[PDB]
Enzyme design. Structure first.
Site, PDB file in Angstrom:
ATOM      1  N   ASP A 188       0.676  -0.998  -0.489  1.00 61.45           N
ATOM      2  CA  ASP A 188      -0.220  -0.282  -0.049  1.00 61.45           C
ATOM      3  C   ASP A 188       1.032   1.161   0.019  1.00 61.45           C
ATOM      4  O   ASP A 188       1.815   1.063   1.006  1.00 61.45           O
ATOM      5  CB  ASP A 188      -0.412  -0.219   1.196  1.00 61.45           C
ATOM      6  CG  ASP A 188      -1.457   1.377   1.320  1.00 61.45           C
ATOM      7  OD1 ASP A 188      -1.256   1.918   0.573  1.00 61.45           O
ATOM      8  OD2 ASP A 188      -2.382   1.117   2.118  1.00 61.45           O
ATOM      9  N   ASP A 201     -13.101   5.431   0.957  1.00 61.52           N
ATOM     10  CA  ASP A 201     -11.178   5.778   1.845  1.00 61.52           C
ATOM     11  C   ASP A 201     -11.167   6.859   1.072  1.00 61.52           C
ATOM     12  O   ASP A 201     -10.551   7.517   0.473  1.00 61.52           O
ATOM     13  CB  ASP A 201     -10.551   5.383   0.574  1.00 61.52           C
ATOM     14  CG  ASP A 201      -8.617   4.684   1.257  1.00 61.52           C
ATOM     15  OD1 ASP A 201      -8.833   5.494   1.996  1.00 61.52           O
ATOM     16  OD2 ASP A 201      -8.539   3.666   1.116  1.00 61.52           O
ATOM     17  N   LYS A 235       3.277  11.689  -3.683  1.00 61.05           N
ATOM     18  CA  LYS A 235       1.636  11.620  -4.396  1.00 61.05           C
ATOM     19  C   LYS A 235       1.059  11.882  -4.770  1.00 61.05           C
ATOM     20  O   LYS A 235       0.090  11.731  -5.404  1.00 61.05           O
ATOM     21  CB  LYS A 235       0.992   9.845  -3.194  1.00 61.05           C
ATOM     22  CG  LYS A 235      -0.003   8.965  -3.512  1.00 61.05           C
ATOM     23  CD  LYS A 235      -0.747   8.041  -3.195  1.00 61.05           C
ATOM     24  CE  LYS A 235      -1.637   7.555  -3.699  1.00 61.05           C
ATOM     25  NZ  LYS A 235      -1.824   6.086  -2.254  1.00 61.05           N
TER      26      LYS A 235
HETATM   27  N1  ATP Z   1      -7.064   9.995  14.455  1.00 65.03           N
HETATM   28  C1  ATP Z   1      -7.136  10.719  13.049  1.00 65.03           C
HETATM   29  N2  ATP Z   1      -8.096  11.505  13.355  1.00 65.03           N
HETATM   30  C2  ATP Z   1      -8.096  12.410  11.913  1.00 65.03           C
HETATM   31  N3  ATP Z   1      -7.229  12.412  11.373  1.00 65.03           N
HETATM   32  C3  ATP Z   1      -6.192  10.842  11.327  1.00 65.03           C
HETATM   33  C4  ATP Z   1      -5.961  10.740  12.353  1.00 65.03           C
HETATM   34  N4  ATP Z   1      -4.946  10.034  12.567  1.00 65.03           N
HETATM   35  C5  ATP Z   1      -4.649   9.731  11.334  1.00 65.03           C
HETATM   36  N5  ATP Z   1      -5.137  11.439  10.581  1.00 65.03           N
HETATM   37  C6  ATP Z   1      -4.841  11.727   9.094  1.00 65.03           C
HETATM   38  O1  ATP Z   1      -4.973  10.780   8.693  1.00 65.03           O
HETATM   39  C7  ATP Z   1      -3.948  10.474   6.770  1.00 65.03           C
HETATM   40  C8  ATP Z   1      -2.999   9.660   6.773  1.00 65.03           C
HETATM   41  O2  ATP Z   1      -4.526   8.496   5.959  1.00 65.03           O
HETATM   42  P1  ATP Z   1      -4.006   6.695   5.794  1.00 65.03           P
HETATM   43  O3  ATP Z   1      -2.545   6.895   6.270  1.00 65.03           O
HETATM   44  O4  ATP Z   1      -4.751   6.146   5.994  1.00 65.03           O
HETATM   45  O5  ATP Z   1      -3.336   7.948   3.909  1.00 65.03           O
HETATM   46  P2  ATP Z   1      -2.848   6.856   2.888  1.00 65.03           P
HETATM   47  O6  ATP Z   1      -3.313   5.897   3.065  1.00 65.03           O
HETATM   48  O7  ATP Z   1      -0.963   7.194   3.796  1.00 65.03           O
HETATM   49  O8  ATP Z   1      -2.885   8.513   1.919  1.00 65.03           O
HETATM   50  P3  ATP Z   1      -4.322   8.632   0.815  1.00 65.03           P
HETATM   51  O9  ATP Z   1      -4.337   7.047   0.667  1.00 65.03           O
HETATM   52  O10 ATP Z   1      -4.218   9.575   0.559  1.00 65.03           O
HETATM   53  O11 ATP Z   1      -2.924   7.864   0.048  1.00 65.03           O
HETATM   54  C9  ATP Z   1      -3.190  12.087   7.971  1.00 65.03           C
HETATM   55  O12 ATP Z   1      -3.303  13.497   6.472  1.00 65.03           O
HETATM   56  C10 ATP Z   1      -3.294  11.893   8.977  1.00 65.03           C
HETATM   57  O13 ATP Z   1      -3.635  13.068   9.098  1.00 65.03           O
HETATM   58 MG    MG Z   2      -4.194   4.809   1.694  1.00 67.04          MG
END
Ligand code: ATP
Ligand code: MG
Ligand code: ATP
Ligand code: MG
Lengths: 600, 600
Positions: free
Chosen positions: A8, A194, A70
Site C-alpha cells: 500500500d 476511503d 503521491k
Molecule cells: N485520529 C485521527 N483523526 C483525524 N485524522 C487522522 C487521525 N489519524 C490520522 N489522521 C490523518 O490520516 C491521514 C493519513 O491516513 P492514511 O495513512 O490512511 O493515508 P494514506 O493511505 O497514506 O493516503 P492516501 O490513501 O490518500 O494516498 C493523515 O492526513 C493524518 O493526519
Molecule cells: Mg490509503
C-alpha cells in the site's frame, strides 16, 4: 520468482503485507512499525533518510524533506492542483523538460517516481528482511480514481525500485478483498469510503458466491485524487496563520521554519480533536520581532475545526451520490459501509457518512492495514495460492477523443469492466492524428489529455484498400494501450505519441541505475558510523586492559596508552573517518605493545 | 453478564481485546491507538489524564505524572527494589500505614491499585465504546513471576476500576494461547521469553492434542519482576548525565525538568539503536550556566549502548537455565522460541536468546498484542464460547513457612500445577502462629513474607480431640487462601493475619467510591470544554447574521453586537466558565434583539 508482496503506497503512510501460507500478514519495518511514513529526506551532510528517520528531522529540514509526493506523481507542472501546491509545499517543485511536475533538491531535478521508488525500496527491503530471501515482484496500490498518467508513473516507481509490478490494484478493491476474506461475508454489497492523507475514493462493490467461489465485482467508483488529510491540515494551518496575524501582528507564511513547527502542530491538534473536544497549540518562541520573541498559544475546539473543514467533508459526499447512481442502487441496497484511511477517524466524517447511508459503518475493519492486506491477497490470487477468488474491476474515467468542434467524444464509458478493448477504423489511408483524453466533461478542454497519437498515411497501391483500425486496450492495471493496423493487409502501423506525460524508456533505465547507485552511496555513507562502533568497542576493551594492569604499569606506558585513548575519543567526536581509523590503529599498536611488554 | 474483556496491564503500555464471535480482536482506544500508555497525570487545574494525554504533558509536570506503577504494585516501602526507585522516580513514593509502597500527589496519599485502576477504567471504557454496552467483567494479566501480594493488588485494581476479575492470567501463558490458537500449531513445546518495560518472564509451555481439544500446559516458569526496559533507560540516562558532567561541568540530576527531558530523549535514543547503529541525543537549552544556556549534544553508538546494558541482558539468561532444568528439558526439546515485549526488539537481546536456544525466534508473533489476545481467549474459555481449549498453569514460587531455626520449610514446590491444595495438622489444641513465605532461599529471612497467620487455641473438653488442620489453597489466579478447621468437630477456625501486605475491604470499598467520584469530577471538567464549543458555534452563526445584515444595520445595533462578539472572544481566551457563559448569554440576547428589530 519468490513471493509477490503487497504494498500500500500511501500519500502519508505505506504498508507492506504478504501471504503467510493461507493468511495475509502485515510486516513490521526495521524500526518495528507496521507502517512507514512515505517520507524521504536529504541532509546537509549528504545522507538519504527514508521513513521514520526522515519524518523525525523534517521540522528542521524544510527544503530537503520530500513528502506527499503521491499528490504530484503523474501530474503536469501547470496543473491547477500542482500550481497551488507550488506556492504551498516547502520543497521546490519545478517543470520537467516535458512539462511534468518534478522536484529539485540541492540542484538535482528528480521525477516523482524516483522519490516514491525510495519508499518502495524500503518496503521491499522490509519484506526481504522478514522472508530471508530476495523479493522482485509486487502488487502496488493506487487510488481508484487515479488516471492513466498517475497509474503508469506509479508502475514506473515500482520498476525504479527493482520490482516487477505484477498488478496495480485500486485501493478500495484491495480493502474489499481484505474485508471479504473472512468466511461469512458472501452475497453482500458494500460501499468502501476511503479518505486518506491525499486522496479520496468511493467504490460500490458486490461480493457474491458463484460456482462455490467468491467474486468481487466493482459496480461503480468515484472520488477525488486531490482531497485528503493534507487539505484538512491546511485549513487549520491557514486559520492559525490568520489568527496570529490579528493577535501578534506577524505573518508566518513568509517563513519556512516557523511553518514546519506549525504544520506539525496543526496535524497533532487535528488528530487530538478526533477524541477530545479541545486542543492547545503551544509553540514557544515560534518567531521573533522588534519587540522580541513571539509565542503562539491558541485553544482550538472541535467546533472550530469542523467549521473550518466541513466543505471538504461535503465534497466527499457528492461523489457518493454519483457512485450510487452509476451502480443503479440506493443506500438501502448497501449492506455494509466500510471506512478506510486515517482521515475517516474524524467524528464529523463518520457522522456525515452514517447519515448519508442511514446506517453505522462497520467497526471491524482496520483503516490502516486493509489495503495492504488486500494487495497481498491479490498477489496470492496471481501466484495461484489463493483459490476461489475472482475479481472484476472497472475503469473510473470515460476514455474519449477530441473530435471536430473541440468536443469530447466517448469511446469507453466510465465504470466499464476491465480489461476491455474498443476498435474503430479512423481512415481509408490518409494520415491520422488522435487526441485522447479521460474525463466526463463535454468539452475536450475540460478533460485530462493523455496525448496525441499519430499515424502516417498509407500510399495508394493497386488492389489496396487501406482500413486503418485503431484499438484502445485497457488492461487489468487500468492502463491504456493504443495500437493500430491496416485491416486490409494485417500490417501493424507505427503510432507516434506527442504531448503525453510520463517517463520514457531511456529515463526509466537511467533512473533504475541511479537508484542502484544511491543504494551503493548509502552503503558508502554508513562507513563513518560503522567505524564509530568499532571505535567504541576498541575503547571499551583497551580500558579493561588498563584497569587489569593496575600499578604494574610504568608511567611512560600508562601515559602513552591514556593519550592514545583520549586521542581516539576526540576523533570519535569528530566527523573525519580517516582520523578515527588512524587513532584506532595507533591505539591498537599501543594496546599490542603494552600486551607484549606485559608478557615479558 | 456482558463480554469478558481481556486486558494486558503493562508497566509501560496497556492493551485490551475481546472475542469477536470466534475471533480475538484488539480494540483501538478513543485516540485511535491499539495500545495505551500506562500513565496517569494530575494537572494543576485538577484534571486527571490517562494514556497519551498524560504522556504528552509529563515533560512539564514530572512530579504529578505517575508511570511504571506496576513496579510498585504489591510491594513494601522498605523493599530494596522500591528504595532504589524512591531516589529515581520523579514523583513522591511514601510508606502507607501498613508499610506498603504508596505514592503521594499534591498531599494525597494513594495506593498503587488506585492508580492502575485509572488505566483499567480507560481500557474498560475502550471496550464499552466499541461494543455499545456496559462491561463489568475482565481477564487481567500479570507477569508469571508476580508473587501473592502483587497478584492480589492487581486484582484489587480491577475491582477499583469497577471490574469483576474473572481470571488473573500469567502473561506468557496468555501469549501462548494467542500463538497456539492457529490451527496447526499443535503438539509442540515452546519457550516464551517476555521482556517488557518493567518485568521479565520465561515460561516453558507444552501444547498438545487430547481428545480433540488443545491443551496448554506450563511446564516451568521463571523470571524477574523488576527487570525491564525502565532499567535499560536508566543505564543510558546515567551515562548521559555523566558525559554532560565531564563536558559542561554541570550535574543535571537535581533539575527535575532537565531529568524529565533526558528520560524521554534517552528512551527514544535506545529505541533508534534497535534499527540504526548510531543515534544523536539533542537537548537544546537543557540548562543554563552563568555563561548562558547550555545544550546537550552527544552521539551514542549501538556499541556504547550494548556495553551499558549487557549485564541486564545476561541477567535474563540465567533464569532460562533454571526454567529448562525445572521443565526437565534441554534447548533441543524446544520447538519454538517466542519473543514477547517491546524490549525484545533489541538486536543484542534477540541474538543472546537465539544463541542460547540454538535457533531463531519466530517472527510471526505480535510482541505488543499477543498477551491481550490471549487474555481475550481466556475470557472466551470462561464463558464457554471458546471450546476445546484447556489450560494448565503453575505457581512460580515455592510456598513455605518459617520453622524453628529461622529456616524455610517448603509446603508447595515451585512449578506445581494450580489450582492446588495442601493440608496439614498444626496443633493438638494449642494456639498456633504460622509465618508464610514465598521463595526458594533456604533461610526465611531471604524470602518474601506473606504475613503471620494466627489461630487461637481450642479449650480442653471431655471427648474432645482437637486437630487443627490448616489448608493452603492456591487458586486458578495463583493466589493463596489459608483456612483452618478442627478435624475433630468440623468447626472452622478463624485465622487472624498480621504483618501482611495489601488493602483491606474497607480501603477497597472507599477506593471504589473515590474512583466513581473521579469520574464525576471528570464529567464536571468537560463542562467547560463543552461550553467553549458552544461558544464557537454561537460566534460562527452570529457573525453570519452581522454579514447578512450588511448596511441595513444601524450604527448603535452594529456597535452593540460587535461589542458582544469581542467580549465572548475575550472570555473564551480565559479560563472562567462563568464569564464565558455570561458573555454567551449577552451575545445571545443581542442576536435575538437585532433579529426581532430586523423582522420589523
Ligand atoms: N485520529 C485521527 N483523526 C483525524 N485524522 C487522522 C487521525 N489519524 C490520522 N489522521 C490523518 O490520516 C491521514 C493519513 O491516513 P492514511 O495513512 O490512511 O493515508 P494514506 O493511505 O497514506 O493516503 P492516501 O490513501 O490518500 O494516498 C493523515 O492526513 C493524518 O493526519
Ligand atoms: Mg490509503
Ligand atoms: N524498538 C525498540 N527497541 C528496544 N526497546 C523498545 C523498542 N520499542 C519499545 N521498547 C521498549 O519496550 C518497553 C515496552 O514494552 P511493552 O509495551 O511490551 O512493556 P509492558 O508490557 O508495558 O511491560 P511489562 O510486561 O514489563 O509489564 C519499553 O521499555 C520500551 O522502551
Ligand atoms: Mg507485557
Amino acid at each position: 520468482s519468490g513471493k509477490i508482496i503487497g504494498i500500500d503506497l500511501g500519500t502519508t503512510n505505506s504498508c507492506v503485507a504478504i501471504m503467510d501460507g493461507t493468511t495475509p500478514r502485515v510486516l513490521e519495518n526495521a524500526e518495528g512499525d507496521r507502517t512507514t511514513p512515505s517520507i524521504i529526506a536529504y541532509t546537509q551532510d549528504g545522507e538519504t533518510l527514508v521513513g521514520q528517520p526522515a519524518k523525525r528531522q523534517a521540522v528542521t529540514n524544510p527544503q530537503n524533506t520530500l513528502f506527499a509526493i503521491k499528490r504530484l506523481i503523474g501530474r503536469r507542472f501547470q496543473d491547477e492542483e500542482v500550481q497551488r501546491d507550488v506556492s504551498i509545499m516547502p520543497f521546490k517543485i519545478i517543470a520537467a523538460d516535458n512539462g511534468d511536475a518534478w522536484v529539485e533538491v540541492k540542484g538535482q531535478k528528480m521525477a516523482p517516481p524516483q522519490i516514491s521508488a525510495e519508499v518502495l525500496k524500503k518496503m521491499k527491503k522490509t519484506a526481504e528482511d522478514y522472508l530471508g530471501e530476495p523479493v522482485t515482484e509486487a502488487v502496488i496500490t493506487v487510488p481508484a480514481y487515479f488516471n492513466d498518467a498517475q497509474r503508469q508513473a506509479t508502475k514506473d516507481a515500482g520498476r525504479i525500485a527493482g520490482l516487477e509490478v505484477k498488478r496495480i490494484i485500486n485501493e478500495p478493491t484491495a480493502a474489499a478483498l481484505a474485508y471479504g476474506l473472512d468466511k461469512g461475508t458472501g452475497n453482500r454489497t458494500i460501499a468502501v469510503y476511503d479518505l486518506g492523507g491525499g486522496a479520496f475514493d468511493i467504490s460500490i462493490i458486490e461480493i457474491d458466491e458463484v460456482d462455490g467461489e467468491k467474486t468481487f465485482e466493482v459496480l461503480a467508483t468515484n472520488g477525488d485524487t486531490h482531497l485528503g488529510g493534507e487539505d484538512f491540515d491546511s485549513r487549520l494551518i491557514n486559520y492559525l496563520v490568520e489568527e496570529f496575524k490579528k493577535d501578534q501582528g506577524i505573518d508566518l507564511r513568509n517563513d519556512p521554519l516557523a511553518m514546519q513547527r506549525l504544520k506539525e502542530a496543526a496535524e497533532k491538534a487535528k488528530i487530538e480533536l478526533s477524541s477530545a473536544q479541545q486542543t492547545d497549540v503551544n509553540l514557544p518562541y515560534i518567531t521573533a520581532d522588534a519587540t522580541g520573541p513571539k509565542h503562539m498559544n491558541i485553544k482550538v475546539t472541535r467546533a472550530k475545526l469542523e467549521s473550518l473543514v466541513e466543505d471538504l467533508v461535503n465534497r466527499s459526499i457528492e461523489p457518493l451520490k454519483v457512485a450510487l447512481q452509476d451502480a443503479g442502487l440506493s443506500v438501502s441496497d448497501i449492506d455494509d459501509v466500510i471506512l478506510v484511511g486515517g482521515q475517516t477517524r474524524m467524528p464529523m466524517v463518520q457522522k456525515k457518512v452514517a447519515e448519508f447511508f442511514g446506517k453505522e459503518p462497520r467497526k471491524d475493519v482496520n483503516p490502516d492495514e486493509a489495503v495492504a492486506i488486500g494487495a497481498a491477497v491479490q498477489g496470492g490470487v496471481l501466484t495461484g495460492d489463493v483459490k476461489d477468488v475472482l475479481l472484476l474491476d472497472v475503469t473510473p474515467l470515460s476514455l474519449g477523443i477530441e473530435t471536430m468542434g473541440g468536443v469530447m467524444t466517448t469511446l469507453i464509458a466510465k465504470n466499464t469492466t476491465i480489461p476491455t478493448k474498443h476498435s474503430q477504423v479512423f481512415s481509408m489511408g490518409g494520415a491520422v492524428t488522435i487526441h485522447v483524453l479521460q474525463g466526463e466533461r463535454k468539452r475536450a478542454a475540460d478533460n485530462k489529455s493523455l496525448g496525441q497519437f499519430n499515424l502516417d498515411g498509407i500510399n495508394p497501391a493497386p488492389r489496396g484498400m487501406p482500413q486503418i483500425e485503431v484499438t484502445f486496450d485497457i488492461d487489468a492495471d487500468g492502463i491504456l494501450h493504443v495500437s493500430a493496423k491496416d485491416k486490409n493487409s494485417g500490417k501493424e502501423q507505427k503510432i507516434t505519441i506527442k504531448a503525453s506525460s510520463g517517463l520514457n524508456e531511456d529515463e526509466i533505465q537511467k533512473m533504475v541505475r541511479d537508484a542502484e547507485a544511491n543504494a551503493e552511496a548509502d552503503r558508502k555513507f554508513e562507513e563513518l558510523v560503522q567505524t564509530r562502533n568499532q571505535g567504541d568497542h576498541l575503547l571499551h576493551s583497551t580500558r579493561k586492559q588498563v584497569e587489569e594492569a593496575g600499578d604494574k604499569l610504568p608511567a611512560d606506558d600508562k601515559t602513552a596508552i591514556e593519550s592514545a585513548l583520549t586521542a581516539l575519543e576526540t576523533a570519535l567526536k569528530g566527523e573525519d573517518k580517516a582520523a578515527i581509523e588512524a587513532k584506532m590503529q595507533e591505539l591498537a599498536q599501543v594496546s599490542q605493545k603494552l600486551m607484549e611488554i606485559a608478557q615479558q
